[PDB]
């Protein structure tokens, strides 16, 4: 059966360009326990700093970019406390930084893409760093001079899986609308989550060892003009799932003092229990049988999950190389992290001279997660280099 | 040119079912100035109550449903103050009420629809009443027993235009995915916006005369099974637009004390300046030339805009009947209001015995607005009754 093309697109959505950006300011992880416990006026919790020193080392993170400088925290001490009224201050920083960081990545993706901005017909903007009305999607549209008639989808506070949601959304936008070009921006920062330490909230302390700032921007479109556009990946399928028996696994409470996390259930075991059949279902239409014949993007919000999945599916230790590089060099930038990893995977495949944007593989899987417990899974097809 | 149907849908997205729900508790507008100034411990502002009495009369609102009872406000006095730290309390009420109110409307829409819940493949959930992680989309999925693999899009804090966004989103979800059935829920309440009066913030006081609680639920799907499903409307086009010279027209600041509005620019003039060409562009593919040969849904967040548009396009005074009925009986329920109006328009067309779900008209326009200044415009096609 055939249908008239009419106003729709013929073929699957493709990533046509990708780029990332971060705040200029960064912290080496080796320096962070000292910096953190100083600026939060918590140097007296010697035994807690010792726990934090161990937490920070086991993250395998090396540096993290952050908007929050010692100077900004000094001018906003409520942000540095464990729990003081500070939401308005955090949202003032979000308005000054999140759309701007998104534009830095968007400029670079549009440059790689090579087409004029006026051909962008849709914008998907994800952030958990600040609820703005109008949103950062609006502010970015104004800063970039995009068409005022652009179709925007603003995704506030989905949490760490939203990079998968953004691709899932962009796929239908691109495929249903002939000529549509979708600018996808995940722009993230710890502005809502950053706070001082508490001996009674170790979960919250662990998040201070991992979360970081950064933005990723993509152009997604179907029916590429192969004379002016160069696909990097195809978005073949995109699915979302609540895992069984995962009620309240990850909760984020938005309060007067910003975002406060609550993580009672064991996240690594939840993923291990379910990852295999989720990826089997994803790979079912490809006829792949070797876990090592595909490329990998796994959200690294809990580094232990990377090791455990690697062992479980018996992956070649180079499979998660791009994933671990981003974790080491940038930390967990919330929903943007899997898109950083995608770009790093592409750049390493090209630099190392492989045959496909998927490190020589044809098929690939992108997997991220967050509150629900929710898992976003994307089936990707590489392109010949 | 033709394309293989493959996994996509053949025809345009259709509304297949619709229903609404509200909190049991309501307030007659004639009683509200007394109730409001009492519970906010503000009876001493006699001159402000007098302004409020006049504001409430000119709204043309008759009743409003609200979660907030005198009892709840007594147990949460910070909510009743103009500006006291209260976000966590407001979000506790959101978690206890917003997904639940959405389920009340969803149950009724699914009943009208007549198919099993397990055929729902997508959920679009809009609210500005509380940022939850996981969102009310998750909570509703759990309360309704929807498939854990449902594709959800959670839309937090877009503001009053999100009813148009929800239809715009559902359209692409339905049309790009063969067999997809999209549950659309706008569930809204004043939980973030409700506060005591200030002589120095008249804008905030006006919003207390209009905002109300309610949920609307729709089933949206392409390729209806005409032996089991009965389309009510077709979603023919859906567009979003930032109006020129409208920077900061509507701003909503999410603070320690909840949502605080800021409305410097003149909203009625902004709409009047731009409405006509926006609707002409919407109607361009229909060949309609008579503004009175189409049916109407206009977001009634500012009642003055209804009169002014009516005069400007010289509408038959019955055109905005369904719109004004919802405003009178329910007030402004944020993004849900245009969907209430759509359902009222359908119910009145059937009850009054007209030839189409569009009061006998073929084409219709749905127009809502909010921060940006953003306008969402939907072109609807009715169905023979």
Numbering used by the authors:
A (entry chain A), B (entry chain A): 7 to 391
Sentences from the paper on this structure:
To explore the underlying mechanism for the formation of the C6−C5−C6 scaffold by PECPS, we solved the crystal structure of PECPS at 1.98 Å resolution. Crystal structure (1.98 Å) analyses and site-directed mutagenesis reveal that, due to its small active site cavity (247 Å3), PECPS employs a one-pot formation mechanism including a “diketide-CoA intermediate-released” step for the formation of the C6–C5–C6 scaffold. The Cys-His-Asn catalytic triad was also sterically well conserved in PECPS, in a location and orientation very similar to those of the other type III PKSs. However, a comparison of the structures of PECPS and naringenin chalcone-producing Medicago sativa CHS (MsCHS) suggested that PECPES may differ from MsCHS by the so-called ‘coumaroyl-binding pocket’ (pocket A), which is thought to lock the aromatic moiety of the intermediates. Despite this, docking simulation predicted that the volume of the smaller PECPS cavity is sufficient to accommodate the 4-hydroxyphenylpropionyl-β-diketide unit. The significant difference between the catalytic cavities of PECPS and CUS is principally attributed to the steric volumes and placements of Asn199, Thr213, and Pro267 in PECPS, which form a constricting loop to cut off auxiliary pocket B from the overhead main catalytic pocket. Notably, ITC analysis revealed that the binding affinity of PECPS to 4-hydroxyphenylpropionyl-CoA (KD = 18.57 ± 1.37 μM) was dramatically higher than that to benzoyl-CoA (KD value is close to 1000 μM), suggesting that PECPS could use 4-hydroxyphenylpropionyl-CoA and malonyl-CoA to generate the corresponding diketide-CoA intermediate but could not form the corresponding diketide acid intermediate from thioester bond cleavage between the catalytic center’s Cys166 and the Cys-tethered intermediate. PECPS first accepts 4-hydroxyphenylpropionyl-CoA as the starter substrate to form a 4-hydroxyphenyl-propionyl-β-diketide-CoA intermediate, from the decarboxylative condensation of 4-hydroxyphenylpropionyl-CoA and malonyl-CoA. However, due to the steric constriction of the active site architecture, PECPS terminates further polyketide chain extension reactions.
